[PDB]
Amino acid sequence: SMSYTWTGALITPCAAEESKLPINALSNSLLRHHNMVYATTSRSAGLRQKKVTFDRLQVLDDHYRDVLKEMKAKASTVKAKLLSVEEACKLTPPHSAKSKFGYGAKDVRNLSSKAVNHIHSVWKDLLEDTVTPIDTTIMAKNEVFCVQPEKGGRKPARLIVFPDLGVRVCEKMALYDVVSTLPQVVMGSSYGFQYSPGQRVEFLVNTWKSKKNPMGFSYDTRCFDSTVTENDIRVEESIYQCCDLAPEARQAIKSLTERLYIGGPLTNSKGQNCGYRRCRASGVLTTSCGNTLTCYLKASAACRAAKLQDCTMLVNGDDLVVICESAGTQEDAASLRVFTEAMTRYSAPPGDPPQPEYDLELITSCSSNVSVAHDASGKRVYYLTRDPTTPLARAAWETARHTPVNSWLGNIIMYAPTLWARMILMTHFFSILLAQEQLEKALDCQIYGACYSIEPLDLPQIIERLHGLSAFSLHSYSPGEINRVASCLRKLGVPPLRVWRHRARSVRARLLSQGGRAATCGKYLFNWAVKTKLKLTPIPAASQLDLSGWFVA
């Protein structure tokens, strides 16, 4: 079936959409080439519609069936609980889109009677009706990028699809505990979301080291969400139903699958019918868990089809990276084409065709590659980095305009051991927070679908917990990583690393003068900036840390 059909009514904005970086004093000190930075608007939604609209052909085989049987057997060991309305209300993110039935997220979290009893009515309707498609809103997403003269051109807006707030709370009732617990049982060490960056780089490196003769590849599915078929979503459902579930959870999971997850009508911000979806919606509770299960099932079956030896999968939503034993040069190239043919029959055709790699640092996965530095002892330490272009473009944008979501903060947390997050992002934003006197103010950040409220003053213990103490002493980064950063700063008109070192010495001194947590920030986050280093010891609060958040679905 077609992933989408369209009526021709437009995907419309609801807020005023800005596309260009504005004139700013603080922003210009980050990057000068402001004209290289753009934000996607609804005006490019038509171009995205074309990319994501296509017929899916899907043919399944015994390898696919065998893998599924094994997954269902694991899933049969999981017991999940049905949350009450009130419990699911408390798990709703603070800034979630308001209901069209006259209450918003703040009312849901407060357990407002109008909100609670509406959700009860939505639940009752899911129990009685397993068929009628549930309405969804389609919106163009506004995201910031930098122009790439080498790439094809400017990226079109992504499209998001989400049901009403009351339906979103019912999803948590039925499925929050399942999406929380089932994937790690079914997929074990292949399940990507159980890992911090320290733990994911450790798993990738040790998986690579464990092979007699390693080969790996990333596999990039073209428009993964659109390749997910109604059958895939029902197969997903059949996995979930293997859990030990309350009878009302079983019924609501069936209804949510048939009425929402497999597809339904799309409504724009003006309330016009835009069309119909028969693939994955980006804004439902099961999208990360379902995409990870589906990608793992297809990949695992395809590994058996291609006869890859000892193939270790690492799956994070639609992100797939596979590390296996090489069968030799020619045999690996052939086997990866057969892997790709099997993924294609399963309706997961590649964007870029995959290629075997024999150096772990050459694989890109979760937009990131493994790189090497040295800790305070001189020991080799592996960590994940990425091209800093997009983080820096978005950082420039968030400096100039007020944004509800702070990509700079999520990038500091996920890329803390990197040369660029330490030298530029930490120095630049701590300088801003000091001058605004906002060091204590909690900020929202979103990381791969989970939302957190983070005070910048707690970054040292958060980084230690996610990365280890070495994240504050890394030095002697690789020439290729230094060159990539240096080159990106010249391209964007960002001051060179030597300028940041000087700005960081000043930020660091001013933090130390404040004592308390600010001084701990100056001591740990900026020990790299000073000639004579302080002795950095494990932070006490790094053990006792609430690293939990909310799903934004």
Give contact residues for ligand JT1 (rule: CB under 6 A): 179, 183, 192-193, 195-197, 200, 288-289, 316, 366, 368, 384, 413-414, 447-450, 452, 454, 462, 466, 547, 549
Q: Which amino acid is at 61?
A: D
Shortest distance, CB of residue 194 to ligand JT1, whole angstroms?
7
- Rank residues 414 and 529 by Cβ distance to ligand JT1 and give the closer one: 414
- Amino acid, res. 20: K
Minimum CB distance to ligand JT1, residue 200 (Å): 4
Residue with smaller CB distance to ligand JT1, 316 or 431: 316
Give min distance, CB of 402 to ligand JT1, in A.
21
Whole-number minimum distance, CB 483 to ligand JT1, in Å?
A: 20
Using the minimum distance from each CB to ligand JT1, give the nearer residue, 200 or 523. 200
The residue type found at 489 is L
By C-beta, is 183 or 264 nearer to ligand JT1? 183
**Rounded distance between C-alpha atoms, residue 230 and residue 216, angstroms:** 31
Of 266 and 285, CB closest to ligand JT1: 285
Which one, of 384, 379, 366, lies nearest residue 481 by Cα?
A: 384
Report which residue type is found at 344: T
CB-based contacts of 203: which residues, under 8 Å, 6+ apart? 189, 195, 314
Rounded distance, CA 546 to CA 455, Å?
12
Whole-number Å distance between alpha carbons of 227 and 125: 30
Helix (H/G/I), strand (E/B), else coil: 147:
coil
Q: DSSP letter for 388, please.
A: S
C-beta of 21 vs 173, nearer to ligand JT1:
173
Phi then psi for residue 521, to 5 deg, are: -55, -45
CB 284 → ligand JT1: shortest distance, Å?
Answer: 11
Structure tokens at 369: 């590659």
319-325 and 214-219: which strand pairing?
antiparallel
Q: How far is the CB of 368 from ligand JT1 (least distance, A)?
A: 3
Question: Which residue, 255 or 291, has its beta carbon nearer to ligand JT1?
Answer: 291
Shortest Å distance, C-beta 477 to ligand JT1? 16
Tell me the CA end-to-end span of the chain in Å, nearest whole number.
Answer: 25
Which is it for the CA torsion 22, 28, 34, 37, positive or negative? negative
Q: Rounded to whole angstroms, how far apart are CA atoms 133 and 131?
A: 6
Closer to ligand JT1 by Cβ: residue 355 or 367: 367
Q: Write down the least CB distance from residue 441 to ligand JT1, Å.
A: 16
How many angstroms separate the CA atoms of 429 and 108, rounded? 33
